[PDB]
Amino acid sequence: LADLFPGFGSEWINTSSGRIFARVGGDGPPLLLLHGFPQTHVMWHRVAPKLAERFKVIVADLPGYGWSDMPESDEQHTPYTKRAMAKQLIEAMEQLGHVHFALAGHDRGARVSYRLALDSPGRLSKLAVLDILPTYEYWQRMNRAYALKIYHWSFLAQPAPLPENLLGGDPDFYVKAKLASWTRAGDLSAFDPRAVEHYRIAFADPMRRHVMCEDYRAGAYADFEHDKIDVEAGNKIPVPMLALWGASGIAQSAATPLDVWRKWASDVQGAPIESGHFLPEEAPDQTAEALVRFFSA
Amino acid sequence: DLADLFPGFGSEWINTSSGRIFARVGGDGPPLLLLHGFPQTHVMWHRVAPKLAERFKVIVADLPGYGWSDMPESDEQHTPYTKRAMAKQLIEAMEQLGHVHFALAGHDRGARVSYRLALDSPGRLSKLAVLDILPTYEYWQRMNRAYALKIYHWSFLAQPAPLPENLLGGDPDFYVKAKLASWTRAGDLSAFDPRAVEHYRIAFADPMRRHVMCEDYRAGAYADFEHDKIDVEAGNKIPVPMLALWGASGIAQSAATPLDVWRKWASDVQGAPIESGHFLPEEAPDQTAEALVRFFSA
Ligand SMILES: [Ca+2]
């Protein structure tokens, strides 16, 4: 497995819920980058060096993902709720002395991120979310067209071991299908093959796949419930936030992303990028520049 | 190895322009076509077909592409697995038997064939029974978080090939037993005859059978939806007397009544809950049989 962050350190951050793996590089204000599904921290390998010019970049595997420990889940998928993940990552950042930091998340990590910003906004200077809407919004908009486009939201949320048993027949196919289908090009050409190897190898572990399902089960239940309470109480993210989304990505398919986020965030700017879902690998320069600009403000 | 679950029924291979329909046929009297759904075969009727054969010529057919029926080759629009095309094929199959006016009961996918047949060709039907469904249009219009989770397979199996095919191949035995068990009231396989499960298991073991089922669900997401949509917008209603049976623990039920939904689609519809999960004819064979013979004799 290639090192795609030459010059970055490697940290195993112990937390009460298990170790967080993270590549660490650069200097300046702390910036935490959170990947999503079905990826690992290495998805930032094209934009993290550019950010590392200006920030201490911390590129963490989510709890349960990549090389991070996998907290044992429970009946309510608690450790893989974005609330628990946010808590664990806050803990991890505290081990490094970062009690106030900037945060950019993509996909699942973007969901940890806005949930972190709702639960503990004092921890965040600025927040960027990449190609998501709040979990609540996906579910609330889940009509026929959207059920087809993000079927995996309901499929992977099916009770164990149904998704796990189907994914275990040919894990490589599924991780590759999900990577391909949500690029602008519809293939694996936007990805560095050494990165795909990271994704493929992470997905080959049956425990890692279970965790991903647990994350999706949390996404269907507790994460939705947590979001529901906030949107029905009018709790908005008070942290300055950037919402970046792909013109060909998931977030824009069932809503205008900046309109949705303005319901969720008191101070949100948005920009589309010509890209599928995987902004940091499909459009690395345009993404890194959007992030450098936002976080330098 | 595969039990004969219809003692006294013969076996017909009915030729159509689109391939052979397999059927068990038994009884005498007015013709009654029984249509199974997913992921079963005609043998799902094995507990109620003998009851019905008392008063009817009961034709228990595998849907096109299911069980032992031939699998017409699909196309880009999944046309042979649209309910319209399946209904046309079964209308032709019934014509081969000299049945141009018949009673029809369908469950699950077969119930979708059945109301689409009733919409397209109402003159072919004396009466229609649909077990544990709402029209495809209604499932998709009610698509929300809760329903998306419960009938996830409607969007999963409609994914472009070969995505569901490949995943189904990951553990087909588990998948078919899971689908069977998860939609029963008990939550396990105890309601099913083990010889029936082996039929469903063995049908599900063929990758081409599984592909056809995905084509069926792809049609269910696209063409089938569009065909239903047209009838909704045109105010077309099913004019055949209709019986809607649903499981109290079934898919069709939710918060609003299935019968209230079917009244938007049919002019003359009666409806009963049956203490059952999805698989009324196996979980509740006597109550299902009784409701069907009483409705179909009129
Ligand atoms: Ca297995």
Numbering used by the authors:
A (entry chain A): 4 to 300
B (entry chain B): 3 to 300
Task: Quote the study on this structure.
Here, we describe a high-throughput approach to serial oscillation crystallography. Using the silicon microchip technology with fast translation that has proven to be useful for serial collection of still data from crystals at XFELs and synchrotrons, we have found that adding oscillation to crystal data collection dramatically decreases the number of crystals needed to generate a complete dataset, compared with still data collection. We tested three different protein crystals for this study: FAcD, lysozyme and CO-SWMb. The high-throughput, fixed-target serial oscillation crystallography method described here is a practical, fast and economical means to collect high-quality room-temperature diffraction data with minimized background scattering.
Since different crystals and different chips were used for these datasets, we performed a further test by independently processing the first 1° data and last 1° data from crystals of Chip 2. It was found that 394 and 428 datasets were required to give a complete dataset from the first 1° and last 1° of crystals from Chip 2, respectively. Of the 294 crystals used for the refinement of the 3° dataset, 164 (56%) and 181 (62%) of those were used in the refinement of the first 1° and last 1° datasets, respectively, and 127 were used in all three cases. To probe the effects of radiation damage, we reprocessed data from the 3° FAcD dataset (Chip 2) and the 5° CO-MbCO dataset. FAcD lacks any moieties such as disulfides that are especially prone to site-specific radiation damage so we expected that any radiation damage occurring would be stochastic in nature. We compared the first 1° and last 1° datasets from Chip 2, processed. There is negligible difference in the processing statistics and Wilson B factors for the two datasets. When the two structures were overlaid and compared using GESAMT, they were found to have a high correlation and a low root-mean-square deviation (RMSD) of 0.072 Å indicating little to no geometric distortion as a result of radiation damage, in agreement with an experiment described previously.
